[PDB]
Design a protein around this ligand. Structure first.
Ligand code: NI
Length: 341
């Protein structure tokens, strides 16, 4: 049945609650972003109002064939009225079109649902600074202090310099990047840009990127694999077998593959610095796992919450085990005592 942490008290609203059939008493279904665990259940046969960002609304229409009459896109940073309740969508710094949702309840409670986010100090200067938040529904994906990772900027720097060096040493090397959902486009776009290539991809993936309002996208991507030296493939194909296979398909145009797997966290982060990352190599194929995250590190999450000073926190991730729940509540208490709210 729909879990309580997907329901917004004092409204008829749910968030990211599309897989439970008809939720009893729900008058509006919000969707924070176009990732499958969140949209699971939507299709062309959905007949209730869906509230989301413009970009998420492009993907509902074009990829899932949801009917236009039921898509209600809202502009960001703008006070809007939904079934008599004031709401605002804010940028979540996750994947394209991902938002956080501020709800202003008739009784005077203010609720922030983060969706999926990577907390950033820039959020401290949005509409959030302007009033108090009583309840926070928080993306707790990496809520544990072992989860450190570099800035997105440092990771992109590493990837650009790596690719550029490899291709300039060997002009017959191909670069490949894995993907399984929207998000992390900076990885492959930044590499293509330094190499003066377009990124080549399947028709299904090109269609997906064409929904995302990226400026100058027609200049950066293509479905012609032959004219491109940066190829995107499913994440599943990023391994020695899948890459040898792909290399055979290119018909002796290339003699080396350099491949990137943008993982979330991996346990080499406890020890290793970004400077010090090394590939796994077999023959003429090298594979780099890089820690490009679109979720908050532990410290970024702690700073955001200690800044917001909410009265109650409701976790949305890692809630399935008692040991996880109990550990998270312990960190919430430390943060509160240390900051004095
Ligand atoms: Ni997500």
């Amino acid at each position: 049945t729909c879990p309580f942490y997907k329901k917004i008290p004092g409204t008829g609203f749910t968030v990211d609650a599309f897989q439970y059939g008809v939720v009893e008493g729900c008058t509006a279904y919000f969707l924070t972003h176009f990732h499958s665990d969140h949209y699971a259940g939507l299709s062309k046969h959905f007949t209730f109002p869906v509230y989301c960002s413009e970009i998420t609304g492009n993907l509902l229409k074009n990829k899932l064939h949801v009917q236009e009459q039921y898509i209600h896109p809202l502009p960001l940073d703008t006070e809007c009225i939904v079934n008599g309740v004031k709401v605002v969508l804010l940028d979540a710094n996750h994947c394209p079109g991902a938002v956080m949702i501020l709800f202003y309840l008739p009784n005077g409670t203010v609720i922030l649902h983060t969706g999926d986010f990577r907390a950033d100090p820039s959020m401290e200067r949005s509409l959030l600074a302007d009033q108090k938040v009583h309840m926070l529904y928080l993306d707790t994906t990496y809520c544990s202090p072992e989860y450190t990772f570099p800035s997105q900027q440092e990771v992109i720097r590493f990837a650009i310099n790596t690719a550029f060096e490899a291709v300039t040493l060997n002009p017959h090397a191909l670069v490949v990047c894995g993907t399984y959902s929207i998000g992390k486009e900076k990885v492959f776009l930044a590499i293509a840009d330094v190499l003066g290539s377009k990124v080549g991809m399947s028709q299904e993936k090109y269609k997906t990127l064409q929904c995302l309002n990226i400026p100058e996208i027609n200049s950066l991507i293509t479905t012609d694999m032959c004219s491109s030296l940066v190829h995107l493939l499913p994440m599943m194909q990023i391994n020695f077998k899948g890459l040898q296979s792909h290399l055979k398909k290119c018909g002796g145009k290339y003699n080396q593959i350099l491949a990137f797997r943008p993982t979330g966290w991996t346990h080499s982060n406890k020890f290793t610095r970004i400077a010090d990352v090394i590939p796994q190599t077999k023959g003429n194929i090298s594979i780099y796992g890089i820690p490009y995250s679109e979720h908050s590190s532990y410290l970024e999450m702690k700073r955001f919450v200690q800044w917001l000073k909410p009265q109650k926190i409701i976790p949305t991730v890692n809630v399935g085990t008692w040991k996880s729940r109990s550990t998270m509540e312990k960190y919430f208490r430390e943060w509160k005592l240390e900051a004095g709210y």
